[PDB]
Amino acid sequence: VRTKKVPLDTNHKRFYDAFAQGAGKLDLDRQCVECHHEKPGGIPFPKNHPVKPADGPMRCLFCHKFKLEH
Numbered sequence: 013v014r015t016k017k018v019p020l021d022t023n024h025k026r027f028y029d030a031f032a033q034g035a036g037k038l039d040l041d042r043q044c045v046e047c048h049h050e051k052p053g054g055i056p057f058p059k060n061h062p063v064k065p066a067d068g069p070m071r072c073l074f075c076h077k078f079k080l081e082h
């Protein structure tokens with residue numbers, strides 16, 4: 013099935029804007045961890061979600077596309 017896109021909402025608008033301005037996806041991915049992380053606090057990944065790699069950030073934007081894209 014389809015994997016979920018980045019919500020276009022107040023929580024993610026700055027990433028949409030940064031992306032539109034030329035920000036690299038790896039730099040953006042690093043900022044996602046602020047909220048999307050493991051216990052305690054924040055927004056935990058579901059069971060079975062991929063875990064972070066040794067080299068560089070988990071590539072959020074590779075699997076979770078922005079909406080409004082071409």
Ligand code: HEM
Binds near residue numbers: 018
């Ligand atoms: C960083 C660029 C980033 C990504 C990528 C990302 C993705 C993401 C997904 C795929 C979801 C699930 C949406 C769904 O189930 O349909 C999701 C949900 C939420 N996020 Fe997020 N997110 C990124 C960054 C951040 C940051 C920095 C925050 C905190 C300010 C944040 C927060 C949230 C919240 C809350 C949700 C729940 C659904 C919603 O209200 O949007 N995300 N994110």
Ligand code: HEM
Binds near residue numbers: 015048073074075076
């Ligand atoms: C990068 C750190 C990253 C974030 C942020 C992120 C978010 C995220 C959320 C919030 C969910 C839950 C969705 C829901 O509530 O229904 C979620 C689930 C899935 N993800 Fe993810 N994800 C990040 C990284 C990655 C990477 C690198 C991949 C692919 C290798 C990936 C894929 C998936 C899949 C599949 C799911 C379940 C289906 C879905 O809900 O989209 N994520 N992710």
Ligand code: NA
Binds near residue numbers: 041
């Ligand atoms: Na990426």
